[PDB]
Design a binder for this molecule. Sequence first.
Ligand SMILES: C[C@@H](Nc1c(Cl)cnc2ccc(-c3cnc(C(C)(C)O)nc3)cc12)c1ccccc1F
Lengths: 146, 142, 153
Amino acid sequence: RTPSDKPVAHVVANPQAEGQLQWLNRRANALLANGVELRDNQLVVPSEGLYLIYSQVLFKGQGCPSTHVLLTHTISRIAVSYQTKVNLLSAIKSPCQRETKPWYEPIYLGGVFQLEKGDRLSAEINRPDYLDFAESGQVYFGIIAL
Amino acid sequence: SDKPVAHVVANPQAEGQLQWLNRRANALLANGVELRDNQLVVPSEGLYLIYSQVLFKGQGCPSTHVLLTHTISRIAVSYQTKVNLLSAIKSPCQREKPWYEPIYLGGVFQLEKGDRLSAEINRPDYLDFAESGQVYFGIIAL
Amino acid sequence: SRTPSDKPVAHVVANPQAEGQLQWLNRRANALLANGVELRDNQLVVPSEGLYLIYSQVLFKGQGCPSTHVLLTHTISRIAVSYQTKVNLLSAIKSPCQRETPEGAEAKPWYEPIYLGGVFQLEKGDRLSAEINRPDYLDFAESGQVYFGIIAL
Ligand SMILES: C[C@@H](Nc1c(Cl)cnc2ccc(-c3cnc(C(C)(C)O)nc3)cc12)c1ccccc1F
């Protein structure tokens, strides 16, 4: 019947953005609906409430170097009333333990959070050079109002 | 309540395949969602949260490099056109003791009436068939 | 304003002040309890029967390897009103150190995140715990690294 009025977003990484994790909505199977905006690479919350927040990144390397590789993926919240950047969800992986075959490290982050109107959300990594885009659906960021 | 929903689980008896079931312990199909040809069929257009999880298990590492994939695809109504919505890859063996590798996926998508969704893996021989609350596939109309 | 969700939900985080322990908090920025979920004696209390996604992440960190004898575990358990003893729902074990650090070599910091997640039929009054064996290896300095939650489907 009547379509959903729930604020939602599902944005995907730009495979040809050099040295960055750039989010896009103008792609097949990506979206912004019911007031969610994508501004300065951040998802902007249109109304207060409970939201599921999620992101996936996929890292890939060919063997292990001598300099220690640390991979991080973090979802942050910038609340309009506080004007502060706070981690909501974060993970750190060390793909190489003993040093030198291609390795793969997916990092999926998800949770339920109380958000405020105007909050800004970012999903970031430290190593965009290790991102893999072999297939579609491997690198994404989204929110769903409950 | 009237929202199309599904939560299907893997068959622990289906040899070398990832077979989804709605006739099991904590599974369901409601408000028009169907399970046909191992694919969830969308009864109406709208926003859906689509999710899944698979578990892989191996005893040690072989000489051949093992890559584990899990993918959720969308097959647009009428056409056979298959497109990845969500996908991940894991390499359990680095240097070639039992290991465990979960892969979980989830996101919100605009779907059309009659779209078919599949949740597939490349290695059903590595599937951890144990009837835990952990190999599943589901959708929820928002 | 839109009608609030009536779904029981929780997202609790580790107390970063409680070093050497895994203490869950709802009384912390960006942590919540809603629609009847309680946090009592470090456990999540289920307010109503149904399907729930239960999830948790812990992050372990060490500087080098003391030997290959470090075992890291994370477990989610259920205490049902009908069977008031812990049953494991989800569990994982990790050995961060494979070869042990040779004397004087760079003690490269290792990281081991463990995610536990699944969908379970729960009953009213179920108590859920998310526990680790090594709180001394837990890295909860920065926010968002260590959490435990439930979402009624
Ligand atoms: C985004 C999410 N995705 C999932 C994944 Cl990657 C895996 N399994 C799931 C199982 C069930 C559901 C789910 C979540 N929410 C519902 C509602 C209340 C909208 O009806 N219905 C099913 C979502 C997920 C996620 C992941 C991790 C931590 C919290 C989450 F919300």
